[model samples]
Target: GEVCPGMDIRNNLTRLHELENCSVIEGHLQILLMFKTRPEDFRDLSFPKLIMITDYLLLFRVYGLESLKDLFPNLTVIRGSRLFFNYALVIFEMVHLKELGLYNLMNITRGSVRIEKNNELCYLATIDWSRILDSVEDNYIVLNKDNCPATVVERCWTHSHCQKVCPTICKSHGCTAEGLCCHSECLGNCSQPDDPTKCVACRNFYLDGRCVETCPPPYYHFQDWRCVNFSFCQDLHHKYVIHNNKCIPECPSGYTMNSLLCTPCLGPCPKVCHLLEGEKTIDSVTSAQELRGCTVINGSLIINIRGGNNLAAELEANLGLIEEISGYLKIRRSYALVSLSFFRKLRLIRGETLEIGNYSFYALDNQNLRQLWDWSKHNLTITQGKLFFHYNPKLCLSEIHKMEEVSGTKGRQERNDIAQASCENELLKFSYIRTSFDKILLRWEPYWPPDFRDLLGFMLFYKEAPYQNVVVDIDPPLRNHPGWLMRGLKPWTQYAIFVKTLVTFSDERRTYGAKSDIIYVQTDATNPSVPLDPISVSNSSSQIILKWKPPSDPNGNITHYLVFWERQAEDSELFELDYCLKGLKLPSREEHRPFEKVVNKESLVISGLRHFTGYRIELQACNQDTPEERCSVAAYVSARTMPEAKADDIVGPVTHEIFENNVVHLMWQEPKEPNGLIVLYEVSYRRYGDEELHLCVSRKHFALERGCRLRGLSPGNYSVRIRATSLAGNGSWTEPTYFYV
Candidate 1:
């Protein structure tokens, strides 16, 4: 009867409606609220003498199930393979059902499809309902009543009528009796009943036979005409024909009538509602629903009284209310789920009403610690070791410092005006001022924009006195949903990690889900063996590069090999912008291969430096288990090199051949910008496009002047252009200018 049965589709549909109402639509949504419903929520609840229908409402609701017509426009051809179904299921589990990155969903085919995967779950697929709607209806009639229509609707008629409908015929051809075939003895002037191949063909045959009246399909009782597409029964949630071809659940204007037989009837309307008169009468019934609330914000719903009544009539009319309501109910609750399921995850929401040290954890702002939470929900059992934080997105580092003038009087940032920011604004909420640290890792699940192409980047900051500059900036090409954002990570330094999610469409950036609860992770240098002392070092006229071999220890779980160097005076206080190490994807088992490309056992050569620059080299390693589980070692000394200025000009001659007219043309060879290099000259020039080319005699002038002569007696004036190049290496070409004489 059904391919995949026993699913709780009805309850899921109800929950979706609830989720949409509790948080987004009604602005009173709740996330972690408990829900205890009954078997009616599961489509598998059976009735005697009836075949079963599978409950897939949750699958459809979450993954956005599409109709067969939507997928294969050519209903006649019937295209679509098992691979497509498998892919859809993969997306359902990976992107829609479970929390995984989009990249992983795209890569699901890397492994073969098995009945049960990882000994944890079984994946099943159902054929598109469009392709089988007519068949299912036919089977229902055959199995239940042994009833086949006298005039059956075929594929051709479905182009005009639904597949489930029976094509009607002409009265003159002995087809006057509706919903049943006429006996040959009843034939009149018409020679024979023309076989109708499809709904269109039936309409044609009736018109040709000069039949004045029309009849609806036998299976569909209430319509004036022929049959229609059967796929509408499956792909579509509601809208089904009832006994006597009458559309029983006649869809009220705005609300769609569901016909999948998914919902169970509560009883008579009056039993569910006290005000109603007769069970089916629409006149005396009032207050169609016990509760109604919009769940999603930025989306609207218009209430229709009549359709609401029909929904009540079908479900015994006792509409229920959501259990929990209020501001951002789902966000914090979902964060709690993340805390229990994932590794060292934190939850951050609008800091306006947040209670901190009550968390009974550490506060990292301004190098000082403060307590925020009071009860610390997990204190008695297992410590989450997570920190909750809040911040004002609009407040800059300077403004946060000045918050004492306004916020101190209240002793907290007032939690009012918590509406979503206007289009022109990016600020959503404020952060707790006492929460700041030098280096912390931030991780959290994020709701990506519906369109991935619209995304721009995210910027993370450490809120401290004047705020420590630890920015985890990401440009286009997001790696994961809960991406790994590391800040103020010190070598072997144990720090808490927090995160905020940012999305951008066009140039407008929207920030949501402020810093998550901080998960505690310790950076350890004891792991990931360090490079040997006296790492090989070299110098050139400009920049420097260093390479090292990882330690021979088997316990080293070095996911990232960090090589950092700073000017001796830059101070450990000054932050580093660039990282020298790259992330390595380690094997899950030792049977996998060891890392390759080990060099001379100690270190590798680094080249290119200024003659007298003083620098320090240090190595730090980072470990990774999840986004929040990164570890690092204290900065260790490798080798340092004395600077040396060695190279002459890459382009030997500045003056080559010159044009007879003074329309000088000049070009220089490109060079690489070394770590330390002197300033390079900027070149600007202007000349007539029609003029002869020549080198500038002075070898110094690069920018063009206002009124320049042409090497050739050119008629029109030309635009000037200029660009700068570094001394050690060539730089990027500047934008060109166009001018007229």
Candidate 2:
């Protein structure tokens, strides 16, 4: 976990490494209960990127810890969401702990810091509490060493009486305040008095140390704060605009405020645009402003006579919001309208009530109207009727074609005029065929232009499944290129592809036609990558038990796992061999045959092996449609079988005594040649012709003085057996013989 939940580190060597490269401790950082661990075990336990703790930092009764001057050096803030008794940093009962060694702690953002009961914990007085604590109060810094001999006293009655008059805090600026209002060249709070060099921050726009009204030419204002270069504020989202050679908060009239800068009325001035109702018609310049801030129009929009010359800017305030028009849209004769860019935000023509039987969009004879609303700026669609384009000579057929294509009325256009008068646009369309792992076959028709000479090829664009995926630009072959074979893509992912035709004029002013419709084509899957290595592998007595994660990418459905293992050469230890094989020496060491088996799960178990033997293993994730579909790389693991023993490996009890009062004492010697080290010993005896039994256990290492003895047994013929246990499992019981008690 990059962000660990937290740690109560009791084991200094093993558990402490969990925070080596950790960034955040979501709970608490604590060190305790490491009674026998020496201070040297944690001397180099430094966390590299440990940033902040959401809770507290605590230490209590952790023996041998002298100081933690270097544990988490870069810890900047503690949120104190979970505190120890209202305190963020707490230390208690650590007898050897000296200083509060948080050298890099700058702030406790919340809560208080307290230390108590640590008699040997001193040096708290040396810390500048104002920097780390929320407040320098007596309540926060309590129960710490009261008298820590000061190293260098700086403040005194006279400058000569003390070795240093001002402490390190005043080292740079030379403390002042005996004189007030030191200088007018400074602003905000000063470092020391009002000297210009000691002043900090500015209320007005400023340079290095002086205030500038306009930041002198090349630099422009930002956030009403600093004055950076004009080149610096040109990103798509700087929230600053260039008007009078200076960056301002908002754009001037006639210029649309886009992202970063206030561009041409390409956009809005920012307003909450989702209200307004009722039927509306634009007959005069005053009638247009009525729909100014409205998003949805309730009725049909009829355009007639409108006294408007500067109608471009006049209707801009109107165009600020026009997302949905519920009724029909009809314009018979509105000459001042050159383009319906004002309806740029009109995304849907709901057609609650049709104008003339079944027409959703109708435009006629607006002589000056040339351009159409390019739906690429924001798409517009008609839900109910066919669009009818008429006698506006300036409005070309290409404009209506794009509008018809986007309006869901492209093939349904019943009324139009192109052959009778003027100029032309191709509507873009995208279609898809079969897709592969890396490419999609995109298909589309070429643009239909009145003049082919003005056509300047098409530019294509594609992007993966939406959010944050950048649109990829492409300029494939202009003609007969066999279904726009889009390549260099990822396997098993969807991409939205589009195309736009470029058309230029006499002055070389090129224009990108409306963008094609979105065609989402998904690619196919392929072979998988490497499977993850075996994790949590362990030895089960005399067998190996392994676990693992499936391959990170099983490009397709994974069918099974190929688990293979091989036993290491037991004869590899030529000089120190087992008693059974010690007298023999071969030309070469023998190794067990490597074997593999297919399993349907992520784990495998291998049994029927000798104890204390090493083996190497590997696993492969497979699609198994064919053997060729296996993972590219196999995972590797290694383990040795746990210690275990057989019945003959231990010796039987040597002697037993049956005294008066039915007391029985049994004694045994160690195994003739033990199979493995012993964890404990188990002994038991059963009386003849009865189910009654007596048992005793002995852990000699744990209690070296204890012995194996039994009491209160009836005098009778009985049998006994003894067994031992190892870390791996229980050893076989010793052979038994009859005994009397």
Candidate 3:
């Protein structure tokens, strides 16, 4: 009923929770290392009625169990499409288990068997395996304790279970003929287990048809389990060499990486490709051969060769190996280059590094070329730039779109008049009208082919996510009045929506036309929720520095936080600033035209506020494509500005005198501009030079004259000053008065 993927159980036995209800295993049913379990735990431990496995059934080192009779009592088969090391059933080294109690099982069907190294397991003699299977190719009955009183060989011989008697085997000495198998690392066919060269394929990757686990010298993992020289490596840059005027990815073993481009060196150096430089324009066959074998071009490759001289034969001969061009491949005015089949290895064109403007890989005015060669069968990629094709009079649009699709640069770049006079009718192109919150109005041209009778309907398919299957189908789609209102999609979710035409002939014959261009429609959005209320970190007569949290349920996206602050009336009702969050009902709107400040980030700082004013603040988290409604109730905050510290705040002059050769008395007139109630007038003085001044304190609570008497001052000429300290902060000092003892 349910399928469990490869469950390679190890160490513990309770990991079988998933397999308990699983009826089929899509991958190997391997139970190993029950060494961490106790024997009594097997009494209730059992897997469900697993009817089959897609791969081998292997039970290695399952130590605690006595038998498999209870567990998998109905296990019936192993349909191993890919046998484990070319084997279907393997039960080895379960030292505590006594029997292969897979009571209702045997149709292993595909590969050999391995049941070895288990001690005191006597069921080997009791089970007549030959009745359920054809003779196995390999039998690993050795190294196991013969618990049967009669010899296992005698029992096996008597029961006809003695088939291919295997040699005692380890990795180096095992055999598939009996219990031993081809070395674990070899795949396909291995004639000699210990000899890696005799393997038909490797367990991992291979190089040049030789069995290798990883890439070797002069080769890299190009793709598809194979290694190759840089010629086939699909990379942007590498060393190059030309053996016979044809490009090889890198030099042979004799040449060093530092060798000159086209020069042979030390007789040990490879004869390298002669790289031409600076706008190496291919004007003729001579220039064509001039760029004999280069993989990369630092700048654009301009092929301007005209006035034929068997140009195709020479052009194709000298130009097959250019794998990358930094800039545009301007195939301008080349009448002889018929098919761009000459660029057989051109894989990528990374444009920005060309240091030029927009256009790269533009093939203009090539009057004779029929099409850019079929990229579906080959491969090419262009990134971070544009691909332009103009005035290729004979080149078709089918070829152009095919390359764009395969290269994935389809709409990411511009499509020029290269396809204007297309040779073939363009398939239905689709674009959308960002109309509604729950539906997308996809506006497209209606199709009525020349053989117009079979135009049946359209199959519009959409996928919620790329990894998932194309679900949410609507056959004979909603409308064809040149539009489709794809309905019922979530407000802010993205959908991969594509459509295809369905057609049927008069004789009941039918076909679905190829897919329309796929559209990754990022639909319009609804307003996001409110941000958290702003917290007052610092609020003053002229400045309010605040911080707040972002919207927890940003239903879509929060473009920016809209900060709204207004002076609140003493009796004004302030809003909740809360959400029954997800639970909603927008509160009554206020008429106050509060000042607004938009911040992309959360924290805010504003100056020029009035003293002791109670300002009400609200934050609105905004979304980009907002609907009619402006999302959740605004988050609200309120606070009064602190006591004022006016710009003109200073203590009046006329202060300071030293007495008793050490005492200093500082006096100053009261502040002219009292911004707020003064809390204290404090004095400070230091010996005339260094700035290490000492404070002489006072307080308004102690009704004294606006002065503080200094007690222990060193007898010296000193500079002194005083300032009024209020609840806000310290005021500026009057000019320093020089006081001599």
Candidate 4:
């Protein structure tokens, strides 16, 4: 409204067509030199109810403007607050300008947008002034030629939302005034206007060929044009609380909320260190004199040692400067301490709060205490704390049965009088009566310690079970009663033993006292050794066979096999005889069975005996639970049998004759009493009207010559037979003869 002073446009084209029917230009709207003005005189440079150009909208040398297409078609906001450097909109030398119609110009926040020398302005590189300006200052849009629209589609519409109004006409890198249809290397330029070479990116950090509006410095604006930094802050900042107000994405501290907003600290553990920079409660010795050298206490380690304070040698030199307590370790009322051996490097107690309890270790009223620091090699685990123990009476039950085999019975229901053997130096009542194969016998019971003349005896020790330092001690006999016979050990093995008690004080310097606990025993047999491999015997003209097995350490329950033999003469030469014969027949009472029927069977058949007599047998085995009667080592062999043949000396009474390739010419006679040695002869043949029966072959002919010659016969028509074989078998077959070749 203020452009008064006679309607401002000094070089008037009729006062710029009377301000193009004004819409709102409040002050500067210059336009000059309308050289020929054609193109329908710039259609009066239309302003179509312009939305705003509050202070700048200048145009110079407008030579028949060719395309402001009906000019200012709905001109949208453009205030430059007074022109020139703050150019809200400027176009110079329109030498037939092509298009600067400012398609719906949306916002131009106080400034810069100079469209230079319009020699033939071709759509001024598809202008996008940052989608109508929330930002865009440094003006000048370069020389404009080459049909103007290209410069990579106006550099992707001056930083993307792409499209500016494109439905078809798109060439040099195709159109895309955000109304997308792009291609010239898309990036934020494409928005798929029904597939114009499919390349898109309305956001996600301006994809492919790259485009961007904000998200720059150390990347921030993370959404709609996404950016990100702080490691996506626990996964996209657990979905929002405060984002663009200056950062707020969390999940750090020990992390565990899920969706990975923080994770580490795995399972059940909660407290992450806090209390011990000096004190959380120590209650005495000057409150632990501020933890002398402190090695991690956190809370509760109270060692209250009473008056005349030596505080148990500076609390045992600061209890080896502690070793992790976290809470509850109370060692109360220490009256002139006798022995917690000052906690010897206190290894771990950790209970952390609520007056501590998975038994939080509390050794109360220490009346000259009597023992503890043996936490079984220190990996100490009474489930981390429990053991309580009461009124320390010389603290016995073998030091609370070595802390009740590692504490934790929920603190054993508060425990009492533990491993009680009527309470004190009492552990031995031992037993294990007898175990031989390697000697054991044991027998304990003494500790009666009140002065049976200061008993100076019993020390035993023994090994094998959990091997206590490989021990072997001994010293028992001053009439020390049924106890100690351990001896060499191993034989079916087991041992462990122990026993203690050697006290002798009459000003005589002696001290190995109270001990016992460990008895286990085993030993007894197994050492026999001899029977494994196939031992055999084969007789038969009267029976012999015998096979064996069971020995390799029978050492115990065998109970049998003593088998005997002894005839020996058939050239008896092989000597070596200690076959365990010890007075030969001790069959104990089977009515004195002596070799005729005592058969415990490991293969037998001793039968009738005389033929070719040579016996020697032996066997052994016996055990009945060992005291060693004969647990093996005998196994002898040497058999005989085969000698009896008297049925016409059993050879045969036959003959045969077939020749011509099916050879058979046999003859016999030796029989008549050659019984003990024919050895082999039996020839036979069959086929002459064969009723089947003859096919024998025996042939050893141990020279008593009883006929021979029987060869491979196949051709038919024959019938011959002869016989006399022996190793105790076949001796009668001869009596056929009807040959034919």
What is the Cα-based TM-score of model 4?
0.28
Name the runs in model 1 displaced over 4 angstroms.
1-741
Question: Could you give me the TM-score of model 2 versus the true structure?
Answer: 0.33
Candidate 4 global CA lDDT score: 0.51
TM-score of each: 0.15, 0.33, 0.28, 0.28
Ranked by lDDT, the better of candidates 2 and 4 is 2
Clash count for each candidate, listed in order shown: 83, 3, 6, 17
Q: Kindly list the per-residue Cα lDDT of model 4 for residues 522-632, writing each as its tens digit.
A: 577554555544343547555666667776666655666666676654321111111112222111102322242223566776675654445666666665423546456
For all candidates in order, the CA lDDT equals 0.28, 0.56, 0.56, 0.51
- Residues 309-408, candidate 1, lDDT per residue (tens digit)? 1122332232222111111111121110101111111222222221233221211111111211222331111122222223322223332233223222
Task: State model 3's lDDT.
Answer: 0.56
lDDT of 2 by residue, 495-582 (tens): 7766665545435333324456766666776766667857625465555666777777776557667666776544334323222122
Q: Write one digit per residue (lDDT tens) for candidate 3, span 1-741.
A: 345566677776667776887755667867776667777866447775465566777777776767665566556555565687777767787777666555435345456566788886665644444433443666556676642113333423223323222333433222332244455444322445555554433444445645566665356542223345645342324414432222244555444443312344454332334334546667678876665555444566677767443436555666656666656566577764556656667777766444245666666677666545656567888875666666775655656777777767876566553642324333567755665656878776556655565566566777664243323333343325466786777556677877666554434223324357776665566666677756866555557777888775564655666667886553322121221222222222256645454656577666766554557887766665244444556788785555565532454564666676587666665543333334444556667655745453434322343366656766677777766654345677767778775
Q: Which has the higher TM-score value, candidate number 2 or candidate number 3? A: 2
Q: In model 2, which runs have C-alpha deviations exceeding 4 angstroms?
A: 1-458, 465-488, 498-524, 536-545, 574-600, 605-613, 640-741
Candidate 3 — which pairs collide?
139-178, 174-180, 175-180, 175-181, 176-180, 328-361
Top-TM-score structure, candidate number: 2
